[PDB]
Fold this sequence. Notes:
2 copies of one chain form a homodimer.
Chain A: H1 11-14, E1 17-22, E2 25-32, E3 35-39, H2 54-59, E4 67-70, E5 73-75, E6 77-83, E7 86-91, E8 101-103, E9 111-118, E10 121-129, E11 148-153, E12 156-166, E13 172-175, H3 201-213, H4 227-234, H5 244-249, H6 251-257, H7 261-274, H8 293-301
Parallel strand pairs in A: 8-12
Antiparallel strand pairs in A: 1-2, 1-4, 2-3, 3-7, 4-5, 6-7, 9-10, 9-11, 11-12, 12-13
Helix pairs in contact in A: 3-7, 3-8, 4-7
Subunit structure (chains A, B): 3CL-PRO exists as monomer and homodimer. Only the homodimer shows catalytic activity. Interacts with host FBXO22; this interaction promotes the proteasomal degradation of nsp5.
Cytoplasmic side (chains A, B): 1-303
Active site (chains A, B): 41, 145
Amino acid sequence: SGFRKMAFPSGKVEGCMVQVTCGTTTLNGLWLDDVVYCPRHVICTSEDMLNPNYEDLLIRKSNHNFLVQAGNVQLRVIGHSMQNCVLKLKVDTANPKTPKYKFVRIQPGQTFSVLACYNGSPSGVYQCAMRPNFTIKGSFLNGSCGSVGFNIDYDCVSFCYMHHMELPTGVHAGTDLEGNFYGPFVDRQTAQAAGTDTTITVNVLAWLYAAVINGDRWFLNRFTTTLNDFNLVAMKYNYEPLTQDHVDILGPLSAQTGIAVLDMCASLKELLQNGMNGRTILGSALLEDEFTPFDVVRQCSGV
Amino acid sequence: SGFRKMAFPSGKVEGCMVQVTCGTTTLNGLWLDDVVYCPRHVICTSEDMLNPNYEDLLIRKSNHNFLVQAGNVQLRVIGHSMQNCVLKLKVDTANPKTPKYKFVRIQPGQTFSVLACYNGSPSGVYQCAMRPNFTIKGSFLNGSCGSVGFNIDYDCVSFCYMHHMELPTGVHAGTDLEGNFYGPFVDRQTAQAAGTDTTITVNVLAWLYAAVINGDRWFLNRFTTTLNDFNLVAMKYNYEPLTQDHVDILGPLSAQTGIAVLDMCASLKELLQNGMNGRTILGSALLEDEFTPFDVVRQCSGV
Ligand SMILES: *[C@H](O)[C@H](C[C@H]1CCNC1=O)NC(=O)[C@H](CC1CC1)NC(=O)c1cc2c(OC)cccc2[nH]1
Ligand SMILES: *[C@H](O)[C@H](C[C@H]1CCNC1=O)NC(=O)[C@H](CC1CC1)NC(=O)c1cc2c(OC)cccc2[nH]1
């Protein structure tokens, strides 16, 4: 038993991280087939970051201006293009370690593993959720851009995130692998504020089901509620509205534990209205919302 | 910025996980050079687990009774021995993916990454600490035995843990790669209780330094204390005694933040005596003790 914030095994993605240097800037790139994907602000100087005109800046760049290094192997760049906020550099060599992969744009509330990298070599792995405000609470320093977030389905790596920027509140922002930012953010050094960080309600319910499964059950009460009589309490505490689709997603967990979704909702309402009173749930003194129901089933079933 | 529970990239260890089957039992094994290491209770039946005589049980086993599978490749077993609580099966093929590796027995308070596996294939990665009572708070189901914990120094994988058992309190127990259990535990199905789970004080101080670095500083006070006048409060709350060696280990962090270790100790005393009062530190409502000072420096420096 036991429930942990668990990340996917990262070897398949480790095999795809390279170093991209342009001018003074060095960041990470993702090498799949004969293409290297990287953030486009690799072509910016410290001066261009305030007000970059990426077309004009990119037009002054030739193939040989892009230094791509996989380990110690220098890749030859034979073409380059810009798709939204992502540069795509064509190299002359297909990555021998290219896995079965997809490009997926995940929905808010979904989770994925981030492989934090620096200078094209891996540094660490951790699990993140796409917040309702399209940010992530990660751990990124300078040079971490180009690091990717991904999921794994058997052997297919679904790349969903590439890191671009840290916001003033310390959360992080990025794009999908097609270069489209999650949320309203843009890749320049201006005043950018993320909106209200609301809680992923279905994820908290899934985490409570994981708690029940792993023995923690003090938070279970004799009450029940209705979906509207749960939402009029969730909106007060900045919780995402619970829909019948969320209820059905939580179906298998409710059937495994024998606890109706609305009764667990009553327990969660009691937790929101009275707090933890100094107790913990699965070793946490906060309500955790970065586990999807799929994460819970996968970790409690051994996938 | 940002501070996360971060695990090592697991590809080098993924390349070493195989499936070991004996009779009905199937668990994981670690394939390095021409040797596969696995827990010895792979030779037990459900009946032998209460009172196993591992010499007598192993003596009834021949090489061909050990089915080793790396992916779909069947390894041929050409010898077998028992070292403490670990079986070592000699195979005819050296693992082509054997990394630079060490066998290390870590001290309590140190951390490592666990690669949770089932049927010899990886399932997830997460960071754990060796508690002062020589247990770990992991996530292990049936068939997870043989999963390993490790650290990485540039390119050298230091294997330090192999999982064997879950205790009644839901924490987990295991051996080093030489087969010696951490703590007083034995690999049989008897009444085994871990002792008092005390807190790794130096790790909480390192985590508070990480908090200060990442902007969280509300817990900083105008007070100071002495080491004895901190220990007579730490022992009340079941905190490991702080030694001058722990102070010196925290030296670089204190010099980077400009906060003396004893002043941070006064802040921690205030936290232990008055609680969090509904606040959070680095997104946690509890004092975290599974980050070593090295973990903090590594994550805030980008190693
Ligand atoms: C790429 O490696 C890097 C990400 C690192 C830097 C520090 N922490 C991280 O997450 N990205 C950047 O430095 C980008 C530059 C790209 C054009 C987007 N900029 C920021 O992350 C950035 C800019 C600003 C502010 O600008 C006014 C204000 C507050 C925080 C900021 N972060
Ligand atoms: C090996 O895969 C497995 C580890 C799994 C099983 C459930 N959770 C895990 O961590 N190990 C075992 O099942 C071992 C068997 C080996 C001889 C040690 N046994 C236990 O983990 C075990 C035994 C008992 C109890 O026995 C009285 C009481 C309470 C909890 C127990 N766990």
